[PDB]
Amino acid sequence: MLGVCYYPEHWPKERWKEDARRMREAGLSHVRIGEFAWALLEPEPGRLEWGWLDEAIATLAAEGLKVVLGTPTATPPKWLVDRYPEILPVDREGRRRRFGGRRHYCFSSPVYREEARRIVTLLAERYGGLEAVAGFQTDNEYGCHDTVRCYCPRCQEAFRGWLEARYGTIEALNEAWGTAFWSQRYRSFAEVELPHLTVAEPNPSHLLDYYRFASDQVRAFNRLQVEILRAHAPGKFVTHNFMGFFTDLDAFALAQDLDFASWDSYPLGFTDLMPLPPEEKLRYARTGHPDVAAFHHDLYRGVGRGRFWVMEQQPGPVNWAPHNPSPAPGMVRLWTWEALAHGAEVVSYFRWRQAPFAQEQMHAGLHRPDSAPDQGFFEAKRVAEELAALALPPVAQAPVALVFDYEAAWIYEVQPQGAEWSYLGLVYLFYSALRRLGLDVDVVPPGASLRGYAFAVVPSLPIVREEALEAFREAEGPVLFGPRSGSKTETFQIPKELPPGPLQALLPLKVVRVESLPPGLLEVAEGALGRFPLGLWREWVEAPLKPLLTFQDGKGALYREGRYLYLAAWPSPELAGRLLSALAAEAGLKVLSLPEGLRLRRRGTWVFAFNYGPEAVEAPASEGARFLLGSRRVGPYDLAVWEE
Amino acid sequence: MLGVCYYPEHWPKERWKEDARRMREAGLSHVRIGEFAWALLEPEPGRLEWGWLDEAIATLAAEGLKVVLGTPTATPPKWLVDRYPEILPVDREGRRRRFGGRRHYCFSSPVYREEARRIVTLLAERYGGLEAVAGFQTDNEYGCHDTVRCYCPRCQEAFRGWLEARYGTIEALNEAWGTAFWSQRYRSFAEVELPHLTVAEPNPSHLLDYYRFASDQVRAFNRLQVEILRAHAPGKFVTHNFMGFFTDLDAFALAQDLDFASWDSYPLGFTDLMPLPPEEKLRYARTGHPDVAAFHHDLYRGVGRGRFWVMEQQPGPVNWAPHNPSPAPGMVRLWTWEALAHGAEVVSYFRWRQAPFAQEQMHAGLHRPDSAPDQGFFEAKRVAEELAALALPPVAQAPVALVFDYEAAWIYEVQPQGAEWSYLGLVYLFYSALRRLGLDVDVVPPGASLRGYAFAVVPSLPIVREEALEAFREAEGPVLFGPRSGSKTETFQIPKELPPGPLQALLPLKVVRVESLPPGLLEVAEGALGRFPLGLWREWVEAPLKPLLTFQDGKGALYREGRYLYLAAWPSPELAGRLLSALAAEAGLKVLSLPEGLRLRRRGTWVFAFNYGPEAVEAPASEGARFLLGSRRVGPYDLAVWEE
Amino acid sequence: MLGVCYYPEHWPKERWKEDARRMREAGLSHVRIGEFAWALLEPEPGRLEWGWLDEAIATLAAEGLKVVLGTPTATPPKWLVDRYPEILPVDREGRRRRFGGRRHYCFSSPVYREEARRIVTLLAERYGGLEAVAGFQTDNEYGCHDTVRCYCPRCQEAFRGWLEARYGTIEALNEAWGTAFWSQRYRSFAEVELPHLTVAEPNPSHLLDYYRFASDQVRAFNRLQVEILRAHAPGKFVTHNFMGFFTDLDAFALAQDLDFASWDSYPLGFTDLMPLPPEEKLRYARTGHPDVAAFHHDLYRGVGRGRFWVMEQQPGPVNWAPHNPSPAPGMVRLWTWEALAHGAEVVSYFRWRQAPFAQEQMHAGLHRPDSAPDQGFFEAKRVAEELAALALPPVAQAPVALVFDYEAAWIYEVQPQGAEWSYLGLVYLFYSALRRLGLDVDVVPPGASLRGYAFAVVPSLPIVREEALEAFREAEGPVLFGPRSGSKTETFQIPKELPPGPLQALLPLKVVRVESLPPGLLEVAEGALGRFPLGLWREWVEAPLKPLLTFQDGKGALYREGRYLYLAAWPSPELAGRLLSALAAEAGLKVLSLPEGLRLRRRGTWVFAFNYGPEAVEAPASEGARFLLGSRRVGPYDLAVWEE
Numbered sequence A, B, C: 001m002l003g004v005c006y007y008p009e010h011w012p013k014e015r016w017k018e019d020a021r022r023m024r025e026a027g028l029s030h031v032r033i034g035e036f037a038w039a040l041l042e043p044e045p046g047r048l049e050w051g052w053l054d055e056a057i058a059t060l061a062a063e064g065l066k067v068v069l070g071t072p073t074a075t076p077p078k079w080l081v082d083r084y085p086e087i088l089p090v091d092r093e094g095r096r097r098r099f100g101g102r103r104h105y106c107f108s109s110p111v112y113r114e115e116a117r118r119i120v121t122l123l124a125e126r127y128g129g130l131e132a133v134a135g136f137q138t139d140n141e142y143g144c145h146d147t148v149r150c151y152c153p154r155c156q157e158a159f160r161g162w163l164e165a166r167y168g169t170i171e172a173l174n175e176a177w178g179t180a181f182w183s184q185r186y187r188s189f190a191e192v193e194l195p196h197l198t199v200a201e202p203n204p205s206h207l208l209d210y211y212r213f214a215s216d217q218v219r220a221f222n223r224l225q226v227e228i229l230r231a232h233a234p235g236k237f238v239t240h241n242f243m244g245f246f247t248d249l250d251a252f253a254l255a256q257d258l259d260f261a262s263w264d265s266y267p268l269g270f271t272d273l274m275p276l277p278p279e280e281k282l283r284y285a286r287t288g289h290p291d292v293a294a295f296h297h298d299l300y301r302g303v304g305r306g307r308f309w310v311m312e313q314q315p316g317p318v319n320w321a322p323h324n325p326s327p328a329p330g331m332v333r334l335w336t337w338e339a340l341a342h343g344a345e346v347v348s349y350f351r352w353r354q355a356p357f358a359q360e361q362m363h364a365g366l367h368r369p370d371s372a373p374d375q376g377f378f379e380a381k382r383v384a385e386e387l388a389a390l391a392l393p394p395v396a397q398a399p400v401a402l403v404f405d406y407e408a409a410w411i412y413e414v415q416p417q418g419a420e421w422s423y424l425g426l427v428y429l430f431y432s433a434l435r436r437l438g439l440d441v442d443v444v445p446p447g448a449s450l451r452g453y454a455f456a457v458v459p460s461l462p463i464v465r466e467e468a469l470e471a472f473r474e475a476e477g478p479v480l481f482g483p484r485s486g487s488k489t490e491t492f493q494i495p496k497e498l499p500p501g502p503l504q505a506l507l508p509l510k511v512v513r514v515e516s517l518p519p520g521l522l523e524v525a526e527g528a529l530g531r532f533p534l535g536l537w538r539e540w541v542e543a544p545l546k547p548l549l550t551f552q553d554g555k556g557a558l559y560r561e562g563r564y565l566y567l568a569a570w571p572s573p574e575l576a577g578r579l580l581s582a583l584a585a586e587a588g589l590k591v592l593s594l595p596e597g598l599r600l601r602r603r604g605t606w607v608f609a610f611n612y613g614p615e616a617v618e619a620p621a622s623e624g625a626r627f628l629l630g631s632r633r634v635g636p637y638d639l640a641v642w643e644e
């Protein structure tokens, strides 16, 4: 199913009927509206004007379109901000932000909590029972513009309450943080402040708990809205639109209070911001890196416990990246089918028509400002026509699972120890390695069952809790643990047994020292798998095990015991590919050496081939395969679907 | 005529007579003093000490030197600052600046407005009628050190008043800014704040009006002083010293209240700061890029409605650039003759003698700190001797006009959409293209008559007002419009007809999409003019017109209809040169393919050839040409003047 | 003698006896403790708990270990900070810092002065007479984390008092600073503020006095503690641990109140932060640049009037650099013997055991967190065993002296005039030049006698006082003055006679102009010494002297008159090496062209050869030389000691 993000409040009411009609002709079935309409729903404090919203919903409903309503807490009215100044967030620098853009509010502000409660309850009671309404989107991209973590007075006092609940006694906190160090000892929770603007570096345990707290604050803010929607809008789904490459917010945790996860895909923008090699940045400027959208579809399908939507899909050039190219001809269609192949229930485009005013006037839509259809429109219409004839098989369990963890991201954010150490970069590297082997991937959280997977990859899991350990023990196939795994306790301390901590119950090895190396410093690690120049991060492993790969000084780089493997160094794409290929073979999985721009994704017995260009490539379809869409020869920015 | 900037207050009174005498022997006729002497004119609040200033003026007058007095509002006394703390400006970060340097005052401060009024009136009444005084310079470089835009309380309230005058009703402002977007809607002007420190990006219309307002504040501050000088100092000219590569202040607008424009040329400093290719940064380290001074002489001659002075001319190394080389031997003379060739009425050097103390102790002067003459002195004296024998012909209208616009600069500053998009860079690129063809240029504002020009170039004019449109319609020769021209309405919105907006009355084409591309991403645009790899910025043009240049995907890069041309992509120096050359030929203009370091400028029937080095070059003088200065073979850092 | 930094308060009391015992078995004789224990010594305001400290000292004393006690003023308890908020420092940006790390206090705070006085007096009275205590370390690394210079209210008022003492009358200050410039004139000391956040650049004289003041504040704070230790702890030495590449604090001045200087060596961390050529950054990642530790041993031996300790020695990877490699096998031993060869009385390692919690949990120690001995332990034990059999000859005067000056650093920090101008970089360049010639170096301050030196090098001495001049006049061998020497008066003004100012009494030459050039801009300076492409900085010298090296334009680059030489340009390593080699030969000193990774240092008749790798090299030992340690063939990361 296809949808679109619409803003009735940006156009003359006369255009509404025409818009709704063309949305239906285009083949769209869902429409999202209202997330930025607070100032229009309540221009004056207490004076509610539902007139236009009732009409807009009515207009869309008349064309048989399902409405997705978003609560408007992302952008509170200027009068509300002026009334309660405490609502405005304070950056890490200590400066109070201002009205003028969006997301100018703090998750700790108790006043904003009540203001949100009020408007959401009103909205929920009024439209909660409508048949035209299919569900809601809470707020809009929690955390965008670095807003998950706030540094105002409200946060400091809220942080103390959080800490007391977690530790009970200030004594437990002192021990956990190791406050004897640098005379940081606290006499009471009242003495603890936010971990910012400290002389020298702040305490890692202190900073991590702050990150945990910040994320929890967002979930609490969201939970409030979900409770209201469940009480006054029964039967209507509730979701939230997560972002690409964003870890400040624990999406796994927050999604527990949702019916399914949704996310906003802008491949070109993410790619322009990614530090890719020179050649790739140019090659994928108009397509996005081949795995940029796919990684997130897999992640969010996992975050949504198997269900997710692409609430916002790029339909043309955006406005916020340093460089904003136009998607190449056919990419909007490719991204759409890709999302669907990865299991997206709905792919909704942002937005229906390009706005001629304000901040995002340069952000394209399915239509230009003069209402003429833009390139994205024709591509979406095409997908609608193709989809009508192609009911999709169900999404099956992928052969490989990738264990992703938000907490891990916070830990490495707090203590990189190596300037080039990157959690997302490490995760992405393993992901692309699997993808280049033609393998489908399921992203899951620590503790989730690995039952049924041929093998699993854990880019890095610094903290290994009992639940996670159990899931690993019950694993039916091999599990590869990345560097720094099990290197921290829950309180951000080095395990008494040293890394890999709890994992030592599975692997008889100890990391006695780690190194972060300057770029360019490489040393070959070699063995039966091959020869691999490696750098950036290296660990000294003490173990009775014969390493599978050894550096020139004789130190091991990769170890294995039973079904468990441990990588003691930052992997290169080459090593990741060969190691993963070897595991796939051992598991009886067939693999393909896909060319640089080709990607595959299965759905049932069907196989989708997406060509990110710039030249045509042949789809590795079995002989006699029956093509449902496209042909064996896949042109650039094009695709193919067949029965394998 | 030649002059110099002098600081009597920096030297023992005994040196004054000797200085005045040597200024006359050197051949100087004008001397500027007093812009930084407030603390010396009023060391105690209310206690005026004109003793030294009366004597200094007397001393200079005795040698027959014309005095140019500058009002001292650029640097208010520490006691005045301590009295009225509101005077101190606040940076974009929200921090209050302090005394210690200069320009530490806000243009909005109503108190400073009165303090300025007072000191200027006193100064004007006392010296306004003196025969020794030829005129005044108001303040000193408005905006230096990013001081045009202030973010204190005074600015916020002053901005509201400005907005109400411009829009009348808050309704008109909401519509203009499109405040429905992100619930930015305002109930009254009282709710509008300064467009800074907002979460996410501020509204472009909001930010643009703030820039318009900031510039207007400076003009108002200046207008006050001009009114006083016109009332108490009749017959005495009034000017201001503008800066190189500075657009925060609308020089065209402010200069309307002046008799002529003046500017401060420091080629070496501007060049070290310019992002030039590696080879050029080294080649022109001691000379300045060949067009750095020339572009500004042309710009300011236009800003001054045909009249301008170089109030400050670099005579040796400066102190403020990351790298401060010495001008190569002969460059001070070259820069001086160049300024004169471009029509400068007076070329005044900063400064007479290098100060041995304070911030600019490393800034050279015509004399070293021990009073011995420095290299600049001999070069200036030489120009004086040469000039005495060479009365100059009048400045004629250039064959080509370049339409420059400060408002355009603000728009692109507010919305670059592409990280490498640069208004000054685009302007400079077209300028150097014309200059390398040996063509003289006149810089004019939008709306100014293009009557008499062979053809005109408009690097980019986002907003096209009726007056500008009219000037284009009445154009006698071709007009080339650069990318993004006519892409915005006065309220920073996309024209209903889409770009190029009003220009569509002249060119039947529409820009339906634009792209900003990462550096290195190039695609050949080809046609009869040649083959040109282009990047950075590209536009999709919908039109019945057959493009003159076409990209590999078939999209047009350059269009023409009648006398109007439109460039839909960022030009390379190669394209700019060939396109401009083709236009010159069509207009019957003769062109020359000047070598990299050679530049020409005419004055009457005379032609000046300036060689920026590093090696000698031949001046392309017609046969039998009569040389007034130099020879056909122009050594590096040297020049030639002949009758063509 | 060898020692270690220990933190009893970080481990269970049960481990104390075992630790003390193993410290003795390892061969250690000194142990430092207590610098970060304030919060443990006084958890409650007024409640002193010396229990654990008495026991720890007792435990260490029982093994026959000498205790080095550090006063705990570096990290004041959170309750003390909460009580007196004024204690917290304010950064240059104007932001108040917070508790959470360390060094969160201001040197100006009069309240903290008394709090320090109290705790230090208590500590001194209680342990001052113990036989187990050998001495004290005041605070801990004054200035770490840019804390020497503070910008709070206390500093502003303290700065005024300082200024009045130095100048007497505001008139003398106005003249010294040249406040006539930009109307900076002051009516009284009360009007002078801190030189920060000024519009445009602050006055150099103003900023320099602030730097002088800031350093003096630290010495005063330290002097207080020294007075207390001399009164209540007679016979016990007093020292302080200075840092590498840190000039904010005048170590020469402060060390006058100490018995000897101490410093903290972390070669890997300093090197990763040094801007070395690509090849060297990789080659020395695990060893540190060959001269990084040595330069500081020489500097601090000089700062300590001939006596110094390495209070903290890197024993493994650290946690604070962008990249933290492990020292290569044998480097801890090499660094230890190197320090001893340079005269270090004691080499104390930081730290005994790696902490499993807090900020430096990734900072290695002699033991891992599980108490197992780490690589550094075995290397230190080896040095202990080797040292026992090798009593060392006394340190003799080096053949060459290098004149280092902290004030010079402040001047160039205030006025680089060239972006790449670097005082430490210039000093280091001359130092490495001498070191590559196999020459030993003594670092001394201006004014110190140069009697006995073959020749001396003065990288740069902007201000030349009478004492310094006298020392130069009495020099027995040649003295080489680097660029910008004698270019400033004590009040940061250009000497009336122009640079090199007072040095013109020794050299008949004047610097009439200087240039700072962009990187890549090079010009050959040539003469009998060779041909040298030079750049970055160049001076125009007016003199009757025939330059020894001349640029292509005929301007001199190097001059000499009698025993005095003057370099008018930034030297390349090649020029520094040849110039220094020529001077050594003339002085009858023998020199060696040591390979890139080899370094030598003598002690008595012994010669130490340190090989920084990566490959083996031959020690240039005279024939028949008797080796005390190692062999003629020195493996990488290894060393040799022999009788020459």
Ligand SMILES: OC[C@H]1O[C@H](O)[C@H](O)[C@@H](O)[C@H]1O
Residues within 6 Å of the ligand: A140, A141, A264, A266, A312, A318, A319, A350, A360, A363
């Ligand atoms: O591409 C820009 C988009 O970024 C987010 O997805 C946001 O939710 C949208 O409202 C829009 O601003």
Ligand SMILES: OC[C@H]1O[C@H](O)[C@H](O)[C@@H](O)[C@H]1O
Residues within 6 Å of the ligand: B140, B141, B264, B266, B312, B318, B319, B350, B360, B363
């Ligand atoms: O080159 C430095 C100069 O910069 C501006 O031109 C200013 O007006 C002068 O006073 C001087 O500071």
Ligand SMILES: OC[C@H]1O[C@H](O)[C@H](O)[C@@H](O)[C@H]1O
Residues within 6 Å of the ligand: C140, C141, C264, C266, C312, C318, C319, C350, C360, C363
């Ligand atoms: O290597 C890190 C070290 O830095 C300084 O030397 C400090 O005095 C030590 O306490 C430790 O923090």
Ligand SMILES: [Cl-]
Residues within 6 Å of the ligand: A005, A006, A007, A008, A010, A351, A352, A353, A354
């Ligand atoms: Cl829309």
Ligand SMILES: [Cl-]
Residues within 6 Å of the ligand: B005, B006, B007, B008, B010, B351, B352, B353, B354
């Ligand atoms: Cl002067």
Ligand SMILES: [Cl-]
Residues within 6 Å of the ligand: C005, C006, C007, C008, C010, C351, C352, C353, C354
């Ligand atoms: Cl320890």
Ligand SMILES: [Zn+2]
Residues within 6 Å of the ligand: A086, A087, A088, A089, A090, A106, A107, A108, A109, A150, A151, A152, A153, A154, A155
């Ligand atoms: Zn807040």
Ligand SMILES: [Zn+2]
Residues within 6 Å of the ligand: B086, B087, B088, B089, B090, B106, B107, B108, B109, B150, B151, B152, B153, B154, B155
């Ligand atoms: Zn202001």
Ligand SMILES: [Zn+2]
Residues within 6 Å of the ligand: C086, C087, C088, C089, C090, C106, C107, C108, C109, C150, C151, C152, C153, C154, C155
């Ligand atoms: Zn302070």
